[PDB]
Design brief:
The structure is cut from a larger assembly and holds five copies of chain A.
Chain A lengths: L1 E4 L4 E2 L4 E2 L3 E9 L4 E6 L3 E3 L4 E6 L7 E5 L10 E5 L2 E5 L18 E3 L2 E9 L2 E9 L13 E8 L7 E5 L2 E5 L1 E9 L5 E6 L8
Parallel strand pairs in A: 2-14
Antiparallel strand pairs in A: 1-5, 4-17, 5-16, 6-15, 7-12, 7-16, 8-9, 8-15, 9-10, 10-11, 12-13, 13-14, 17-18
Bound molecules: a molecule of 2 linked components (NAG-NAG) (2 copies) and 2-acetamido-2-deoxy-beta-D-glucopyranose (12 copies).
Protein name (chain B): Spike protein S2
PDB class: viral protein
Keywords: SARS-CoV-2 Spike glycoprotein, RBD, CR3022, viral protein
Chain lengths: 201, 370, 99, 49, 414
Amino acid sequence: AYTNSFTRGVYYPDKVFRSSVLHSTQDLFLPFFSNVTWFHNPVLPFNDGVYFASTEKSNIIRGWIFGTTLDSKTQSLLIVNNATNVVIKVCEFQFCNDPFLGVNCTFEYVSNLREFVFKNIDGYFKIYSKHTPINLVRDLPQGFSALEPLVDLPIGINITRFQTLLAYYVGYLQPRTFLLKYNENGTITDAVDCALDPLSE
Amino acid sequence: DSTECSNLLLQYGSFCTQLNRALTGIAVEQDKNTQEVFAQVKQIYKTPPIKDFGGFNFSQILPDPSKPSKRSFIEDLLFNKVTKFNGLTVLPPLLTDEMIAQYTSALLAGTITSGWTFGAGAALQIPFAMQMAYRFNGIGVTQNVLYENQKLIANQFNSAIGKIQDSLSSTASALGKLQDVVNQNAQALNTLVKQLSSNFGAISSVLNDILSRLDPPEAEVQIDRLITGRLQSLQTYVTQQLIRAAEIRASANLAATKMSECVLGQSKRVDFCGKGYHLMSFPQSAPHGVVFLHVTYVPAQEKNFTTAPAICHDGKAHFPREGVFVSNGTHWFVTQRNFYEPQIITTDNTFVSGNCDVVIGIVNNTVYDP
Amino acid sequence: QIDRLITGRLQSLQTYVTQQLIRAAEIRASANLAATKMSECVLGQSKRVDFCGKGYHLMSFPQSAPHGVVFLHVTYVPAQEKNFTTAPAICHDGKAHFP
Amino acid sequence: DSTECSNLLLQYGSFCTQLNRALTGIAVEQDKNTQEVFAQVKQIYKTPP
Amino acid sequence: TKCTLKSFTVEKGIYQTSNFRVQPTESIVRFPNITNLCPFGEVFNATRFASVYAWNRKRISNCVADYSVLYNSASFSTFKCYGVSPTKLNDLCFTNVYADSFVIRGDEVRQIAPGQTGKIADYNYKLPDDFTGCVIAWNSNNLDSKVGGNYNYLYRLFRKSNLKPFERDISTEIYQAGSTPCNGVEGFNCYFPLQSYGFQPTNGVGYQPYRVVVLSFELLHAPATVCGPKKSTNLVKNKCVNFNFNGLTGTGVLTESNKKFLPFQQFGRDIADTTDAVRDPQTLEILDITPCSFGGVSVITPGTNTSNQVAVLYQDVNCTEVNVFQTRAGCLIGAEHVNNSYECDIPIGAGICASYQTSQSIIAYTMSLGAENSVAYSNNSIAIPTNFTISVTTEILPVSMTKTSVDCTMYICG
Ligand SMILES: *[C@@H]1O[C@H](CO)[C@@H](O[C@@H]2O[C@H](CO)[C@@H](O)[C@H](O)[C@H]2NC(C)=O)[C@H](O)[C@H]1NC(C)=O
Ligand SMILES: *[C@@H]1O[C@H](CO)[C@@H](O[C@@H]2O[C@H](CO)[C@@H](O)[C@H](O)[C@H]2NC(C)=O)[C@H](O)[C@H]1NC(C)=O
Ligand SMILES: *[C@@H]1O[C@H](CO)[C@@H](O)[C@H](O)[C@H]1NC(C)=O
Ligand SMILES: *[C@@H]1O[C@H](CO)[C@@H](O)[C@H](O)[C@H]1NC(C)=O
Ligand SMILES: *[C@@H]1O[C@H](CO)[C@@H](O)[C@H](O)[C@H]1NC(C)=O
Ligand SMILES: *[C@@H]1O[C@H](CO)[C@@H](O)[C@H](O)[C@H]1NC(C)=O
Ligand SMILES: *[C@@H]1O[C@H](CO)[C@@H](O)[C@H](O)[C@H]1NC(C)=O
Ligand SMILES: *[C@@H]1O[C@H](CO)[C@@H](O)[C@H](O)[C@H]1NC(C)=O
Ligand SMILES: *[C@@H]1O[C@H](CO)[C@@H](O)[C@H](O)[C@H]1NC(C)=O
Ligand SMILES: *[C@@H]1O[C@H](CO)[C@@H](O)[C@H](O)[C@H]1NC(C)=O
Ligand SMILES: *[C@@H]1O[C@H](CO)[C@@H](O)[C@H](O)[C@H]1NC(C)=O
Ligand SMILES: *[C@@H]1O[C@H](CO)[C@@H](O)[C@H](O)[C@H]1NC(C)=O
Ligand SMILES: *[C@@H]1O[C@H](CO)[C@@H](O)[C@H](O)[C@H]1NC(C)=O
Ligand SMILES: *[C@@H]1O[C@H](CO)[C@@H](O)[C@H](O)[C@H]1NC(C)=O
């Protein structure tokens, strides 16, 4: 299955405040109105960044695995929110053939629609996210919202493939130029994909 | 704020100095432009408390004595329609807006109360109706026209001023020219400032990062790349400013000529002072510019007449002294060219020359002898 | 080393040439103005106001000068004046007489 | 048609886009020149046969 | 002015000769709160240490390493760093640091060093010849000795070959000293490869236990997570400073700001990519960075022919930050403010002009636009001239320049 990524996947590219400003920036964004794979635990590629999204009523999706082999051969990020506690590990874990939860470690940390952006640049694993209420079943909602950064991991583990841990969506970022509009309060209120159509160009 | 960068910069000689010198020349030139456009009157004339200008109503162009800077209503409309710490400063103009307003008020009051005489010499008062009679004789329309249509002319003028107010209040793009100028300058500066964030081939756009990270022997090469880039940015900016200032100087010379010939006199150059026959002009200030309100005479309702080049009375050929022979089908008259005012043909309308066997188109008529 | 020198001196020459082009544009505009003044002021009698001096133009005389021209504008200036009463027209037999 | 050269060129910032801007300004100005010189008549008059 | 014009005489006018710029009074450095300190304590202060043959390694990552706690301590008799100064380590970040800890006897401390041989270096713990890092050692007689002799610490006595740098061998294989295989059975030419130190408190200092920690530093193709303290200072507002916030440095005046930064935003930015406000890393407040007052210094002078007295106009500054006159063009010093209006002689700006007038001094005044006048306008009164004058004016126009021609090759490559 596939679905329309109307105008979602836009995230604050940095930690710089700007007010009432139209700023043009080129980064790995989810191209507007592109195809996002829609799923109801397959292994997926991580070419150059992954926009991930989930709609929930019972907290089914729990976590993620990122890595290269994910079979206790090379380090691999494991990000699991176990029922109250967020745990991030980068141990050379040995994973199951189908790693489901019952219905050498170099780092370790412990702490409706949800959007996440997982990208890996120069050994840093940027995780952006945004939570919102929603009343919709069969598809992503249409509208605009910007994603705050939440985690910047110094992990250094290079990632090629990944998998989810339990309806969700996967889209793939591309190196595109965007025009971002910042209102008086420093927040992104609109965006224009600079390679979508001639009017946007 | 970088000693090492300044030491490197001193090797390029006087590029910096001549850039500064060019910009200073531009600034002085701008002050000269404004001075030569507006300061064309040696004295500051002021209108009397009486507004007895023959029915013409100038209240929307004369200064408002209870107002921001003693500007007229239209000047205020014009002013409401037109809208750092990196080594860039903006020097203030030598003539403040209040002084420009005083100059245009002087020009306007001199024009109203004296005509063109204040430009030629001492301002000699003259009733405004008589001044308009002069301005009508200046376009080939006898003055009795004005004196017999004075109320209509005054009402048309007042309505035209009202329409000008409406046009300026409704359409902002009316002042596009001025606005464009401002935009251009701003954009240039923005571009210049943004050029500080480029690398030009260095490892970083931040001079301090290069200095703090690299050893001097290589930080020097990186800073040389940055210096060449930024010096080229400055040179491009200054050259664009020079060319654009030439543009503005040409327009300022044109505006000075228009004020001299159109406001301080009555021009006869076609379409120099608007479409129509020029009667007068009124200057108004505007941000970094001037606005001329050209009052012109435009013939409106026209008629078909039969015409002749001369008439044959006793074998003599009679030509019109000033006018043209016309016929309404039965009788012949001699009217002025620019306005149908037919008059009986008499030997003081026409002058004799030759006989009827040479002119091609001579007609027959009787020339009354008073 | 010579490449650095050549780039510097070539840049200086380009700057000089560009400034000269703009300055020559200035001078060409002024030369056109002077030619127009000679045509309309010396070879005729201009009626353009303030084009040929303050006052009503009578004539002009051109004088050479180093890299330029100097016009002596002879103009007419009204000097002494009087207040008079004035009228736009006068009734004689009911009819209006205008000057 | 060189990606590496283009990536090097965009290190200079707006050294190129402003050249394009200046040239387009010149072109618009040329059209304005021609219109000012010739389009001084509102209607197209015609001589009689 | 005389130098800036390269002349000993200066014509009447207003010249810009230099730039006024406030200097920074002091320096401020601000870094985030120093937390997540590296756990050196669990290495240096561990109650039990490893045997040298089984030396422990602790990985130090993602933390602030306050090396001073180590190099200012009086608790160490050996503190020897090769290729690095621990003081400069405070300014450096590494992907990993490694603390290798063990116990040897005093006479063997010298063997923990590059290019050394002996029992310990050959068979137990080996440093590389190009070792970069530190060796720290202190006597542990009070902790590792016992009256009856502490034998819990072991060393490897036999091995088939020398250790490679940082190699760790914990095998208890029976050492085959002869040609007969041992098959795990001890006997003639078949020896256990380990032997206990005998640590008694009355031993000579050369035979007393010493605890040793070796610090190694590692940079990988991964984020550098072990960084030095990088202490900060107090911040002062409303006065020009040179500042260094988390990653940015500059000069300006820091003032309480008006902006509402998002919880994750650190630096403000103007439209033209200029830093505008900063978030203080320790106090969650936003500080506007207004760059320190600066501007041109113009010299207003009559011709040196007439006088050598000058007035100085500081452009776009207050009269506190430099017979003083505050004009819209800046602060003017040495020019006497007069109420009377005159014709403009030396233009200053915003309608102010300065001139040298009578006993004589330089004065600044709002320039006059000309004598005011009224025309006695009435609806039935006209003024007619009765005489005239013939006036000859003089208009000077440049026509041409000098025809300079420049030889490019001769100018450039003489
Ligand atoms: C000249 O025209 C102005 C209007 O342009 C007249 O001012 C108006 O006067 C009426 C009556 O007092 C007011 O209701 C309007 O609001 C005024 N309009 C403006 C724009 O001021 C003025 O009265 C006219 N001059 C004379 C002498 O009548
Ligand atoms: C052409 O004009 C003449 C003069 O205006 C007209 O003759 C006059 O006609 C009026 C009547 O409207 C008489 O009262 C005058 O006495 C006439 N004047 C003379 C001198 O005869 C003439 O009728 C006009 N022709 C046309 C076709 O309208
Ligand atoms: C997504 O791809 C499918 C074909 O794979 C196409 O039919 C659809 O139009 C695409 N989505 C959009 C928004 O164009
Ligand atoms: C910005 O936030 C304030 C509250 O802090 C709010 O009052 C204001 O309306 C917001 N601005 C916009 C444009 O929403
Ligand atoms: C004048 O007459 C011509 C015919 O000769 C006609 O075409 C034209 O419309 C007339 N003008 C007016 C104003 O009626
Ligand atoms: C005007 O044209 C007509 C038509 O040919 C001709 O008969 C007449 O002689 C001409 N008259 C003049 C004065 O041109
Ligand atoms: C005018 O009248 C004369 C006689 O007086 C006659 O010879 C001539 O033909 C007439 N011309 C016209 C154009 O009617
Ligand atoms: C005309 O009368 C006015 C009185 O208002 C006076 O000011 C003016 O000087 C007089 N003109 C001459 C030339 O005397
Ligand atoms: C940082 O530590 C200081 C004590 O040194 C404390 O006063 C301050 O509240 C801390 N800041 C934060 C953001 O916790
Ligand atoms: C180790 O413990 C001692 C107790 O005397 C203490 O002074 C020292 O600071 C501690 N060092 C570390 C690194 O924990
Ligand atoms: C200026 O000073 C010189 C002496 O250097 C003198 O010869 C000249 O007359 C002076 N001129 C004026 C106008 O003061
Ligand atoms: C500088 O002077 C202006 C008035 O010209 C005043 O408003 C301002 O407060 C002064 N500066 C300071 C720091 O007070
Ligand atoms: C100028 O006049 C003002 C009053 O308008 C007065 O306060 C001030 O002291 C006067 N200055 C001088 C220098 O006379
Ligand atoms: C006109 O002015 C001249 C001086 O230029 C004087 O000699 C002459 O007498 C004046 N004439 C009259 C009539 O005032």
